[PDB]
């Protein structure tokens, strides 16, 4: 039930709602924001030239084994990621690893 506040399953896959902090020591999940319903993700990339977006997508593509696109928030800290062709059950399993 922990990550469920940050996810919903559409016909296309799962929209994972995140809030990023760039120039981190490691790209990783550090928590959840219970009011915003977003996973707190640290991203080990500078927020310039799209590099934090790229690193974020790379991390989740590797985690989920699925294409990940930013559907909203390309220029925001609050980003919605579509994990294409995956179920919510599969995403929860991988986030809980
Ligand atoms: Na960026």
CB atoms within 5 A of ion ligand 1 belong to: 47, 50, 52-53
68 C-alpha to ligand 1 centroid (Å): 15
59 touches 65 (CB < 8 A): no
C-alpha pair distances (Å), 4 with each of 61, 75, 82, 83, 90: 19, 24, 15, 15, 12
Supply the range of the domain harboring residue 7: 3-95
43 touches 55 (CB < 8 A): yes
How many independent structural domains does the chain possess?
1
| Cα–Cα nearest to 18, from 60, 65, 63 | 60
Rounded Cα distance between 28 and 59, Å, is 8
Determination technique for this entry: X-ray
| Cα–Cα nearest to 73, from 16, 32, 24 | 16
Rounded Cα distance between 42 and 93, Å, is 20
DSSP at 72: E
Task: Provide the resolution (angstroms).
Answer: 1.2
44 contacts: CB under 8 Å, gap ≥ 6: 23, 24, 25, 26, 27, 55
52 C-alpha to ligand 1 centroid (Å): 4
Strand pairing of 13-21 and 38-42? parallel
CATH number, domain with residue 28: 3.30.1200.10
């Amino acid at each position: 039930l922990y990550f469920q506040g940050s996810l919903r399953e559409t016909s296309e896959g799962v929209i994972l709602s995140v809030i990023v902090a760039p120039n981190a020591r490691e790209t990783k999940i550090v928590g959840i924001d219970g009011t915003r319903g977003r996973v707190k993700v640290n991203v080990a990339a500078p927020p310039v030239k799209g590099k934090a977006n790229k690193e974020l997508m790379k991390f989740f593509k590797k985690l989920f084994g699925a294409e990940v696109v930013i559907v909203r928030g390309e220029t925001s800290r609050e980003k919605d990621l579509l994990i294409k062709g995956i179920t919510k059950k599969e995403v929860i399993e991988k986030l809980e690893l």
